[PDB]
């Protein structure tokens, strides 16, 4: 009644390797440490593909969830209990 | 640990030369003498001025109510 299913799947994706695209086209693949009700994602050990194609290694990242276009989660969470 | 609107209150207590950046407008920033804020970070500036980066012709604005939905960054001097 209060919290939705996709934020439960986002909380279920913590510890896993998620790849989050942001509003400025930058793709961040790495270990999602923590995520909140708003989609503020503290992630770590991040491989970053910018818009040009350059890849950087940013070891501790906190993305503001407003700017997140989407996150690609592991398909393990296709069997997560809140997706039933 | 400093919370931000406390430092805005300290800014107006200092009446600093607050330069405010803009959302999505990277060219034009605004100098000012900050007087008042609110719950939603609307800012009134006493002698506010537009500064470009290509033009850099500082235009004086007077006391403005710059909306909270437009600011990015409140630096000093």
């Amino acid at each position: 009644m209060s919290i939705g299913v996709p934020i439960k799947v986002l909380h279920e994706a913590e510890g896993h390797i998620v790849t989050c695209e942001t509003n400025t086209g930058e793709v961040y693949r790495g270990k999602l440490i923590e995520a909140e009700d708003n989609m503020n994602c503290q992630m770590s050990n991040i491989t970053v593909t910018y818009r040009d194609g350059r890849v950087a290694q940013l070891e501790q990242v906190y993305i503001r969830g407003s700017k997140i276009r989407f996150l690609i989660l592991p398909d393990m969470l296709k069997n997560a209990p809140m997706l039933k | 640990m400093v919370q931000p609107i406390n430092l805005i209150f300290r800014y107006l207590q200092n009446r600093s030369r607050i330069q405010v950046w803009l959302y999505e407008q990277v060219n034009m920033r605004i100098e000012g003498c900050i007087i008042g804020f609110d719950e939603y970070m609307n800012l009134v500036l006493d002698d506010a001025e537009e500064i470009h980066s290509k033009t850099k012709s500082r235009k004086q604005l007077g006391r403005i109510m710059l909306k909270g939905d437009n600011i990015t960054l409140l630096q000093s001097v």
């Binding site: 209060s2 919290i3 439960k8 279920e12 510890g15 270990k31 393990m76 069997n79 997560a80 209990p81 | -």
Partner: protein, 852 residues
């Protein structure tokens, strides 16, 4: 997959996928005292994660305790692993490998087999009984096995429904329990960063009878789901511990307002819990539906017709919901096992973290070199095949994959205790069903089929054709000493092989079981007590060998000590007549045997730190302290081998030529001993002189090992030898009136009462006593019969004390079937053991000399 598993809240594909991500795994041992709520807590977690598995109304489903002797005795006997997927307070599902360990202190070894494969501990404490014997012993063994310790104060309903304490005074009870656990952890650990408080989330409060389980965060989240705008973690920071609530300023203060206000725990947590339990048990018919409406709980009309205990369990299952405070506590405060891999490898791996394989085991990666470690062997109920249970610390076991099992005697130079075994099947072991898997990645627990043959107690499974420098994990250092000794023969000797087969099987099932054959052909089982050996004997006669087996009387293993230095400096030449060794044996300093046994010293140290210890602690010269060769029968045994050979009289390189064989003979001599072939204890063996032969085919090996044993024996016997009794520390939980009855029961059995102290907040007393373990046979039966069941005792091994007799006393006549008096008990204890051993009738001090 491919098996018929029960209906569960999660699904097994998600469990098998949480197995891969080893950040979402918690290897947890639920350990505590006897009957402190661990099996019922696992029952509550199983009922949470399995909708079709439900506890009966009048009788608790255990769901571990899957043995017949566990179901009949009511005492947990073996550790049952349960792998569930439990959701957290934030809703995040973590894989939980839970070891439900027996809380009976005799089965403490079983807890050690769970403590090895765990990264954390939930110590279960009865809120009524408080901290008991095995809770102190498992605090000690949990912070000494380098495990993160959390506390579940189970049975808080006994504060409400039994003691009927006021909520302030039951808060004082829970606070006293948390303070007692903090004092025990500060006692057994120099670090004070592992303070246990419910403010930190380290302490959970529970009632596994009624499915109450909350930390402060999970009780604060009930407020956060009832009232929206509150952030529950900041609230949980204020709920416990002399913080009062000001409802006019709406703020939590340390200063008490009104001079009769309650703490935040009493106001916000304990009084709602009391009002829930009091409205259920007292006012079901009158005023339960309006308070249930106030709590948001609606029960069906069929559900309100329940009796008061199932209705309590149901009301608190609807109020508290899932056991997310347990998952809060074990996720915030028990490592990852990715984080917990490095203390596990530093503590339990023999190569240490600094090895090339210790690094790759600290990384805990499933695509690494396979380094599984099994501590438990679980028999299938046909009794024939065992399944080795343990955790994968690196790599991935696969079903059908050939594998290299290393036993406990595998060193890298003695590579013969290994065997290449084909792994048959892999199971994720929940208690009453096994999820058959194709592979098990690192960090996870696994039942392995097919590796059971080359191992007895403890294995390191590696892979063949790689990991050539793979060492074993350390054997299970047990909490206690298997002391009670029973002889075991078949009724019909023709079915001796079945019994021998069964003896091997109980050696696999019970981790601190010692099955040996003495020189008389007598088969001997060592156990920790009479319940332990009763279950061993049940499994021996019923599970493994289906034959009839005579048991002897329970006896104890004795130790052997000296009380003064040896009279003449004893010597022994080899059968070559070269290589004379000349030793004296003197008693160790007080507390030194406790220091060698509890690893306060090691011979694995360098000579500088070891000599510095023995100089600064026991007034040894650095001449003597730099001359320590070995440490008793094992590397941590209560004897010391020193050489006081001056380098003037002895060539020191020629002495280091045979240091290994003299050490081997000394270790074998202290392992058997000349009085009754039972371990020498607390004896310093000083090599005074050593002639050594010059060429190496005249010294070494078959000459100097038995010669060193003979000079250890003669140096021991010329010092005045005493037998040592094992003493059981007995913690009796009696009523206040039965204390003088406990004293009376102990006075008939040579037991000295250390203390009789009131359990604070309970009407019971704890009588702590020291009985001899030879006098503890039927002591708990004597106590519970004499007190009409009101007193109850748990007795565990504490120390060895010198028997009041003198064992080398031929002046003493012993009529064979009489209880001897104290001043010649040692003379009874020495020769009967010698008869049991079958050695000669008496040992003379001149048996191992060269003069006769």
């Amino acid at each position: 997959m491919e098996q018929t598993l029960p209906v569960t809240v999660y699904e097994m594909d998600f469990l098998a996928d949480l197995m891969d991500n080893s950040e979402l795994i918690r290897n947890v041992t639920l350990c505590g005292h006897l009957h402190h709520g661990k099996t019922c807590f696992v029952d509550c977690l199983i009922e949470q994660t399995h909708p079709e598995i439900r506890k009966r109304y009048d009788q608790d489903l255990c769901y571990t305790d899957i043995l017949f002797t566990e179901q009949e005795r009511g005492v947990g006997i073996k550790s049952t692993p349960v792998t569930v997927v439990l959701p957290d307070t934030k809703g995040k599902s973590y894989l939980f490998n839970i070891m439900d360990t027996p809380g009976h202190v005799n089965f403490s070894d079983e807890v050690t087999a769970g403590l090895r494969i765990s990264d954390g501990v939930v110590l279960f404490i009865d809120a009524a009984e408080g901290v008991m014997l095995n809770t102190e012993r498992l605090i000690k063994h949990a912070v000494q096995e380098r495990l993160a310790v959390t506390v579940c104060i189970n049975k808080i309903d006994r504060l409400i429904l039994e003691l009927k304490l006021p909520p302030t005074d039951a808060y004082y009870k829970l606070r006293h329990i948390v303070d007692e656990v903090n004092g025990l952890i500060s006692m057994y650990s120099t670090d004070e960063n592992l303070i246990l408080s419910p403010l930190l989330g380290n302490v959970c409060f529970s009632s596994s009878q009624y499915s109450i389980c909350f930390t402060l965060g999970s009780f604060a989240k009930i407020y956060a789901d009832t009232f929206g705008d509150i952030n529950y973690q900041e609230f949980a920071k204020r709920l416990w511990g002399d913080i009062y609530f000001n409802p006019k300023t709406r703020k939590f203060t340390k200063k008490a307002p009104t001079s009769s206000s309650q703490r935040s725990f009493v106001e916000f947590i304990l009084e709602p819990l009391y009002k829930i339990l009091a409205q259920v048990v007292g006012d079901v018919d009158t005023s339960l539906p309006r308070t249930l409406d106030e709590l948001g709980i609606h029960l069906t009309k069929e559900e309100l017709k329940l009796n008061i205990r199932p209705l309590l369990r149901l009301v608190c299952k609807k109020f508290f919901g899932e056991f997310t405070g347990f998952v809060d506590m074990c996720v915030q405060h028990i490592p990852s096992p990715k984080v917990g891999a490095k203390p596990k490898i530093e503590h339990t791996y023999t190569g240490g973290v600094d090895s090339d394989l210790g690094e790759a085991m600290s990384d805990c990666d499933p695509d690494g070199p396979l380094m599984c470690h099994t501590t438990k062997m679980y028999s299938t109920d046909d009794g024939v095949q065992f399944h080795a249970f343990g955790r994968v610390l690196s790599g991935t076991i696969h079903a059908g994959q050939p594998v290299k099992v290393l036993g406990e005697n595998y060193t890298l130079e003695d590579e013969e205790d290994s065997q290449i075994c084909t792994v048959g099947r892999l199971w994720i072991s929940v208690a009453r069903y096994h999820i058959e898997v194709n592979r098990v990645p690192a960090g996870n627990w696994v039942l392995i089929e097919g590796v059971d043959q080359p191992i007895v107690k403890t294995a390191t499974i590696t892979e063949p054709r790689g990991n050539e420098e793979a060492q074993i994990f350390r054997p299970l250092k047990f909490n206690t000493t298997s002391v009670i000794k029973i002889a075991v023969e078949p009724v019909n000797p023709s079915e001796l092989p079945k019994m021998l087969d069964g003896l091997r099987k109980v050696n696999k099932s019970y981790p601190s079981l010692t099955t040996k054959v003495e020189e008389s052909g007598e088969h001997v089982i060592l156990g920790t007590g009479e319940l332990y050996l009763d279950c061993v004997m049940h499994d021996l006669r019923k599970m493994y060998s289906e034959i009839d087996i005579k048991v002897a009387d329970p006896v104890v293993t004795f130790c052997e000590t000296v009380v003064e230095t040896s009279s003449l400096k004893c010597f022994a030449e080899t059968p070559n007549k070269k290589n004379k060794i000349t030793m004296i044996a003197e008693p160790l300093e007080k507390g030194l045997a406790e220091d060698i046994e509890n690893e306060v010293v090691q011979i694995t140290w360098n000579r500088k730190k070891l000599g510095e210890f023995f100089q600064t602690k026991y007034d040894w010269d650095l001449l003597a302290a730099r001359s320590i060769w070995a440490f008793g029968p094992d590397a941590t045994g209560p004897n010391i081998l020193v050489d006081d050979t001056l380098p003037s009289e002895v060539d020191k390189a020629l002495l280091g030529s045979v240091k290994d064989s003299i050490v081997q003979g000394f270790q074998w001599g202290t392992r058997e001993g000349p009085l009754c072939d039972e371990l020498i204890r607390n004896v310093k063996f000083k090599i005074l002189d050593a002639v050594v032969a010059q060429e190496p085919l005249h010294r070494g090996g078959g000459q100097i090992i038995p010669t060193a044993r003979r000079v250890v024996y003669s140096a021991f016997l010329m010092a005045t030898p005493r037998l040592m009794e094992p003493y059981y520390f007995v913690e009796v939980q009696a009523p206040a009136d039965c204390v003088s009855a406990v004293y009376t029961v102990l006075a008939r059995r040579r037991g000295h009462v250390t203390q009789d102290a009131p359990i604070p907040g309970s009407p019971l007393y704890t009588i702590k006593a020291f009985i001899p373990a030879i006098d503890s046979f039927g002591f708990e039966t004597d106590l519970r019969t004499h007190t009409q069941g009101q007193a109850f005792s748990l007795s565990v091994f504490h120390h060895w004390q010198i028997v009041p007799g003198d064992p080398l006393d031929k002046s003493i006549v012993i009529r064979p079937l009489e209880p001897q008096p104290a001043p010649h008990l040692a003379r009874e204890f020495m020769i009967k053991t010698r008869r049991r051993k079958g050695l000669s009738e008496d040992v003379s001090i001149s048996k191992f000399f060269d003069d006769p």
